[PDB]
Amino acid sequence: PKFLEKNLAKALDKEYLLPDINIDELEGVDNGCLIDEALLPLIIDEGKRKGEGNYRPRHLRDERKEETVQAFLDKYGYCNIPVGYEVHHIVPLSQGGADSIKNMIMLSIEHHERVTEAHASYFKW
Amino acid sequence: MFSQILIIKPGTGISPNIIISEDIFPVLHSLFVEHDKKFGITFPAYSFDKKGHLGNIIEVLSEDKEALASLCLEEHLAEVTDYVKVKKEITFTDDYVLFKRIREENQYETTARRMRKRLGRPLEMHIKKKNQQIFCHAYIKVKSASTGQSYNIFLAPTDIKHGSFSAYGLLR
Amino acid sequence: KGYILLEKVNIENANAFNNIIVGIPAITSFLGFARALERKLNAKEIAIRINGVGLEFHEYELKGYKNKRGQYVTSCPLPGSIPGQNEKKLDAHIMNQAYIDLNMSFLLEVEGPHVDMSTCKSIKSTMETLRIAGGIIRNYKKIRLIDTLADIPYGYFLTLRQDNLNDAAGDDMLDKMIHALQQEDTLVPIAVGFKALSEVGHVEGQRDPEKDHCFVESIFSLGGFECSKILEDINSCLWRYKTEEGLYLCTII
Amino acid sequence: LKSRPENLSFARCLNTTEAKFWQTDFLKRHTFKLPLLITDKSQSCTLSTECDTLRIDFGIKVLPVKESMYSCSDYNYRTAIYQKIDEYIAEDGFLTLAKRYVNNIANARFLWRNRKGAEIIETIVTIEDKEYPSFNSKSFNLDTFVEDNATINEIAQQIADTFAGKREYLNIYVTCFVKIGCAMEVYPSQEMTFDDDDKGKKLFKFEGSAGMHSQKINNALRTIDTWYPDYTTYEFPIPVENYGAARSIGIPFRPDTKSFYKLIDRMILKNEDLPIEDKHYVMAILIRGGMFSKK
RNA sequence: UUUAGAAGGAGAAGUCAUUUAAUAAGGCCACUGUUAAAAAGUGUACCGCCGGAUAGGCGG
Structure with a gap:
């Protein structure tokens, strides 16, 4: 059936966004964790800038995989997520973000809440 | 270990940690200062989850039964009996969890104070995250009688069943 | 018995051309692929046998472009040296061919003593060496066991439609196909198998000198597409081999 | 009768106004008031280091339960529930519920945190200029x-006779005095924030003085349910709600058969009688009001 | 063990020139939005002392 023909729209729906910042070079990030509060507008703006118009419906989104979180933790030498922190995707998975190490950052619970609230407000979740 | 049980009544419309910070905990602190710090505190319903909760129950702990009985808690908590319940029995127990004051508290503003006495960004940042580790635990607001300073005593559980208590009944 | 799904396999340059048909490969191509996978697994002593296959389409691209009149024009690779009398020349003859790229998920119906995740991992380690209809397996999302029709991800199964072909206007079998296709726009013709043109024997030049041989004509039929969300019985899409006294047939039972 | 109708709802039979705070000296409190203002930055409220007592004024209007049925698409269902209210009035004249509500006035539950540790809490009830x-x-x-x-008993009797439709209405005005130290903090109710970036705590102004929401005061009055099935395990009254939820304890106290929906369905559709305590609970929710349509 | 197996499609380029879219017009008549909600979450910390101490510990 003609609706199953490959097209660029279908192809782009299976290619995923990454953030442009590097968590290994940001002064105020160390061992994959955001150590400085001052960078939060950059992480928020990166999420906004990448996310605009790149909505993926749930069946097309990347699955959040525990293997990805584990490999992120392994890169920085954690056995587990440290007490009081949560791993965040700089570009949200609903807005095109890949479930990859290059898209993750680890935030404190309150900073995680603030970033989540800002992205929800911007994308109208 | 001997013990006596304090229950904060549900359904009063007041968050239990308010009754702890304002009524129970200062009275217990006062008793421990009056009676030479012989006594501990434990929180049977404690759970950590995402943020530490003490739960609505306190047990006072003592190595001596008569020492604990001499505190006569029913008589001192009398005017708060609308929402604080005291169990009449003192129970010996082999099961209890001691708690300690967390060995760091606010390194950020303490370091700012020390530089006022005496931040570099990497130092400031790491200390910020050390603070944010601390702030997820349970805590009690206290205003010091001897100095008037107001502060949050952060608490953590420990498996160590014996040792010297502080003026707040925490394992030193 | 059990059911293994090969999920969203990508195939490059599947052989798209049959004597009467350009597009979807012959059904025998897919079932022969499944048989080759069986033989590979059995040679490792996994002892699985695969009794039937369900073919679910997810994407396709015929190698070609659409004319302004909407018809496809088929692409060829530039041919290399072809053996025979003229093989030395730099320019070599162009024969009838077409190629299609497919995104497809395969349901397998399986017998084995140890149908579990270890044999899925064995399929994973095996499938990298095989081809589908002469096409190269570029990528696949996952290999897994399944238990219910709610497990299959959204796509369209291909199933047999002998009823619509026989019920068509009765002038001629090719006229039956033509009238059926002209009445039922969603149906498609497919190559189903082979009819013996000569009695079983041995002849010179065989691929193998020791396995009995036939000359054959391709058999064609009419098939149609069913959404996996609309399937009711899993058996309604399982293509299986059948043999009848000189007919070699894929069919659904 | 076969089901709850496509629309079914009851208006509040026990209406409550917002509350305005006032500030007074406790001696001569009967002659003097000052408006209690809110201080910015997170907002906070305190007495002005001079008076040692807050005052609260708020009003109640009681309406007859039989007339509060706001919409009901089935005339037979309306007739049945009116008859069941008449039956309940024949069993007792709402007096037990009225006594519970008047207890929740007299015990000053409506003060919430402001009750805690005050030296004296005096409450005055005024009806038709009788004090x-x-x-x-x-x-x-x-x-x-x-x-x-x-x-x-007297207040509860007048409220109960109002519920039974022996009166058209009953306007009750409540005044409370709470005695506390000279600058002890005062806790008006907070406003919601709609995820504005100014997430800081804001407090409910009313006429420019501090106030409490009508919701808080009504919900305090509704703390009368002691009939929920395992009250013997907990012994504290809950605020009346359709599932007996509570905001402090996550566990609902009336899922399944003791829920309002099941008890109404049993009482009306199956025409079952049921225990007086559950009849009190059902009529207490009719007093509360709500939507009770088909799901 | 699959209409099996194999494949370089390639180089280069002036689309230009010109143009009246106009003329005319009733959108109107009627209408019940409606009953019911704890903004919580201690929002939050403070000031010293030991330690070269950024490390790491302390009293209130």
Whole structure:
């Protein structure tokens, strides 16, 4: 059936966004964790800038995989997520973000809440 | 270990940690200062989850039964009996969890104070995250009688069943 | 018995051309692929046998472009040296061919003593060496066991439609196909198998000198597409081999 | 009768106004008031280091339960539930519920955190310019309902006769005095924030003085349900709700058969009788009001 | 063990020139939005002392 023909729209729906910042070079990030509060507008703006118009419906989104979180933790030498922190995707998975190490950052619970609230407000979740 | 049980009544419309910070905990602190710090505190319903909760129950702990009985808690908590319940029995127990004051508290503003006495960004940042580790635990607001300073005593559980208590009944 | 799904396999340059048909490969191509996978697994002593296959389409691209009149024009690779009398020349003859790229998920119906995740991992380690209809397996999302029709991800199964072909206007079998296709726009013709043109024997030049041989004509039929969300019985899409006294047939039972 | 109708709802039978705070000296409190203002930055409120007592004024209007049925698409269902209200009035004249509500006035539950540790809490109830003798609310604990105080009995009788439709209405005005140290903090209710970036705590102004929401005061009054199935395990009254939820304890106290929906379905559709305590609960929710349509 | 197996499609380029879219017009008549909600979450910390101490510990 003609609706199953490959097209660029279908192809782009299976290619995923990454953030442009590097968590290994940001002064105020160390061992994959955001150590400085001052960078939060950059992480928020990166999420906004990448996310605009790149909505993926749930069946097309990347699955959040525990293997990805584990490999992120392994890169920085954690056995587990440290007490009081949560791993965040700089570009949200609903807005095109890949479930990859290059898209993750680890935030404190309150900073995680603030970033989540800002992205929800911007994308109208 | 001997013990006596304090229950904060549900359904009063007041968050239990308010009754702890304002009524129970200062009275217990006062008793421990009056009676030479012989006594501990434990929180049977404690759970950590995402943020530490003490739960609505306190047990006072003592190595001596008569020492604990001499505190006569029913008589001192009398005017708060609308929402604080005291169990009449003192129970010996082999099961209890001691708690300690967390060995760091606010390194950020303490370091700012020390530089006022005496931040570099990497130092400031790491200390910020050390603070944010601390702030997820349970805590009690206290205003010091001897100095008037107001502060949050952060608490953590420990498996160590014996040792010297502080003026707040925490394992030193 | 059990059911293994090969999920969203990508195939490059599947052989798209049959004597009467350009597009979807012959059904025998897919079932022969499944048989080759069986033989590979059995040679490792996994002892699985695969009794039937369900073919679910997810994407396709015929190698070609659409004319302004909407018809496809088929692409060829530039041919290399072809053996025979003229093989030395730099320019070599162009024969009838077409190629299609497919995104497809395969349901397998399986017998084995140890149908579990270890044999899925064995399929994973095996499938990298095989081809589908002469096409190269570029990528696949996952290999897994399944238990219910709610497990299959959204796509369209291909199933047999002998009823619509026989019920068509009765002038001629090719006229039956033509009238059926002209009445039922969603149906498609497919190559189903082979009819013996000569009695079983041995002849010179065989691929193998020791396995009995036939000359054959391709058999064609009419098939149609069913959404996996609309399937009711899993058996309604399982293509299986059948043999009848000189007919070699894929069919659904 | 076969099901709850496509629309079914009851208006509040026990209406409550917002509350305005006032500030007073406790001696001569009967002659003097000052408006209690809110201080910015997170907002906070305190007495002005001089007066040692806040005052609260708020009003209640009681309406007859039989007339409060706001919409009901099935005339037979309306007739059945009206008849069942008449039956309940024949069993008792709402007096037990009225006594419970008047206890929740007399015990000063409506003060919420402001109740905590005050030296004196005096409450005055005014009806049609009759002023009733002041409740020494400290004498009432929060766990037990007093059945025998004559002032409670008289107020409860007038409220009960209002619920039964022997009156058109009953306007009740409540005044409370809470005595606290000279600059002890005062806790008006907070406003919601709609995820504005100014997430800081904001407090409910009313006429430019501090106030409390009508929701808080009504919900305090609704703390009368002691009939939920395992009250013996917990012994504290809950605010009346359709599933007996509570905001402090996550566990709902009335899922399944003791829920309002099941009990109404049993009482009306199956025409079952049921225990007086569950009849009190059903009529207490009819007093609360709500939407009770088909799901 | 699959209409099996194999494949370089390639180089280069002036689309230009010109143009009246106009003329005319009733959108109107009627209408019940409606009953019911704890903004919580201690929002939050403070000031010293030991330690070269950024490390790491302390009293209130």
